[PDB]
Every structure is written in C-alpha cells, then in structure tokens.
UniProtKB/Swiss-Prot annotation:
Gene: SRK2E
Organism of origin: Arabidopsis thaliana (Mouse-ear cress)
Subunit comment: Interacts with ABI1, PP2CA and SLAC1. Interacts with B'ALPHA, B'BETA, B'DELTA, PP2AA2, PP2AA3, PP2A1 and PP2A2. Associates with MAPKKK18 within the nucleus. Interacts with ABI2.
Active-site residues, record numbering mapped to chain: D129
Residues of the full protein shown: 12 to 317 of 362
Record-given protein name: Serine/threonine-protein kinase SRK2E
Reaction catalysed by this enzyme: L-seryl-[protein] + ATP = O-phospho-L-seryl-[protein] + ADP + H(+); L-threonyl-[protein] + ATP = O-phospho-L-threonyl-[protein] + ADP + H(+)
Function: Activator of the abscisic acid (ABA) signaling pathway that regulates numerous ABA responses, such as stomata closure in response to drought, darkness, high CO(2), plant pathogens, or decreases in atmospheric relative humidity (RH). Involved in the resistance to drought by avoiding water loss. Required for the stomata closure mediated by pathogen-associated molecular pattern (PAMPs) (e.g. flg22 and LPS) of pathogenic bacteria such as P.syringae pv. tomato (Pst) and E.coli O157:H7.
Length: 275
C-alpha cells in the first residue's frame, strides 16, 4: 500500500486487504472522530475518466443510508479516495447471528433499505448495481443500514433478468429488496429448497416459477404476507413498485419521520493524478 499521509488529520487505524471494501486502509479522522475507509489508485494512466465518472457519481450521493463520499487526496504515489466506513459488519451477518429478525426489526431495516434504494433511483442515470445482496451497517444501538454504491447466489436475481433481453433495472431491484426482506424474516434464502439447497437447477427453477414457502414456525401479520406476495411476481409489469411499497400498510407502521468537497477541487485533484 501507500505510505501513510496527512498523518496530521488522519490516524492510521489498520491496513485491510479483503472484504466489502476491497483492499483498503481504515483511518480515524481526528476532527469529528470517526472511522473512514481509504481506497488508493495508482497515479499512472490508471486515472482515466471511468475513475473520474465513478468518483463524481459517488460524490453526488447524499443520503443517511448510503455510503457517502468524503474527499479525494493526492499523494505522489496514488490518488486517495476517502469515504465513510460502515463498522457494523454486514446485514446478513447480523441476520444469521440472530437466526432471524422479529417482524418489527425487519421493518426497521426494510424501511431504510427502501428509502435508500428510492433515492438512488431518483439519482440514477444508468441504473448502477447497488449489489443489494451485501448491504452493511454502521455502528450503534439501532444500527443504520448502509448501501454501498461503489465502482472503482442466484437468489437475488429476478425472473426477467435472466428471462428477457430488455429489462427494467428498477423493477429488478424491488425483487432484490423482496429477497432481503424474506431473509430477514425467515433466516434463509427465498428459493433454496432444503433437501439440497447447494443445488443450482433446483434453485433457478424455483425462481422462475416463484415457488417459495414461508415455513410453519415463522409468524407474520397478513399485511406483511401481502407485501411479500406483491413483490414476488414473475411478470415485471405487475410487480409492485417503490412508490406503491412506500404506501403499503406494512411499510407505514412505525415509519420514522426522517424517512463537502468542491466539484472543482475534486476535478483539479484527479487531473494531477493522471501524472
Ligand atoms: Cl423472533
């Protein structure tokens, strides 16, 4: 990695090399006292527009449930991209430590998930890949959901995505959100037959036929059971939409009231990096 820099504003926490944050460096920003992750791109021709595009796109996302961008810093060795770090670990990690969430707990996360996805949708020009199978959490009493919109199993894929040539990515996202909700409530993926889940034909098969089964021991209000059924619809034109979900009885219950660097300075830093 690159030798520590602005020691004076950031305290080196540790140098990671694997995870949802690729290869990176954790740092504590001395003022505001908070963890931050740093990514590094080599100064060479590796600094093309693609990188510029992603940096800007990520720099525009300003939402409490999204991994916010922080600042670019130039070191002779590399361009440093600094962003907020979700300490909390992964959502999926918390789900399987608990076995499964209570209905109320799942709603608490789903509300954040849908708010953050809705925001990304209103800010998407090409429909990036949220990778909703791997959302993170910050760290605190009521952990906050964090979606990773960076760039630098079959269960989450809607039937159309494989099925049809042209497919709306925003409808595909709702399906993915459905799968995450099922997982939170049930503790297992939506279409992974027990007998032999590791299988593939069987799982893809279930997806295409929408065969899912909330097990006996899992109890949930019928309003919740309705929402799920409106999400797991094979035909996209008929799948419930984000605006409708925000208006669903189940979603409304307990809905909380809630739910930088100059563009130039940034552009000036990327250019230099090109050398
Ligand atoms: Cl429970």
């Amino acid at each position: 990695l690159p030798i520590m820099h602005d020691s004076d504003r950031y305290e080196l926490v540790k140098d990671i090399g694997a995870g949802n944050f690729g290869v990176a460096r954790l740092m504590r920003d001395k003022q505001a006292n908070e963890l931050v992750a740093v990514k590094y791109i080599e100064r060479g021709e590796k600094i093309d527009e693609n990188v510029k595009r992603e940096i800007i796109n990520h720099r525009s996302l300003r939402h409490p449930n999204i991994v916010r961008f922080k600042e670019v810093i130039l070191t002779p060795t590399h361009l440093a991209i600094v962003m907020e770090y979700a300490s909390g670990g992964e959502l999926f990690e918390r789900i399987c430590n608990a076995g499964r969430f209570s209905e109320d707990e799942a709603r608490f996360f789903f509300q954040q998930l849908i708010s953050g996805v809705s925001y990304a949708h209103a800010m998407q020009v090409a429909h990036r890949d949220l990778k909703l199978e791997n959302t993170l959490l910050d760290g605190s009493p009521a952990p906050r959901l964090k979606i990773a919109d960076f760039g630098y199993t079959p269960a989450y894929i809607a039937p159309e995505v494989l099925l049809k040539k042209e497919y709306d990515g925003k409808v595909a996202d709702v399906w993915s959100c459905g799968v995450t909700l099922y997982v939170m409530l049930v503790g297992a993926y939506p279409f992974e037959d027990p007998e032999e889940p590791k299988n593939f034909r069987k799982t893809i098969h279930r997806i295409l036929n929408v065969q899912y089964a909330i097990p006996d021991y899992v109890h949930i209000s019928p309003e919740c059971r309705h929402l799920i059924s409106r999400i797991f619809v094979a035909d996209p034109a008929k799948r419930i939409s984000i605006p409708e979900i925000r208006n669903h009885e189940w979603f409304l219950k307990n809905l909380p009231a809630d739910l930088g660097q100059s563009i130039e300075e940034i552009m000036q830093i990327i250019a230099e990096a090109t050398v």
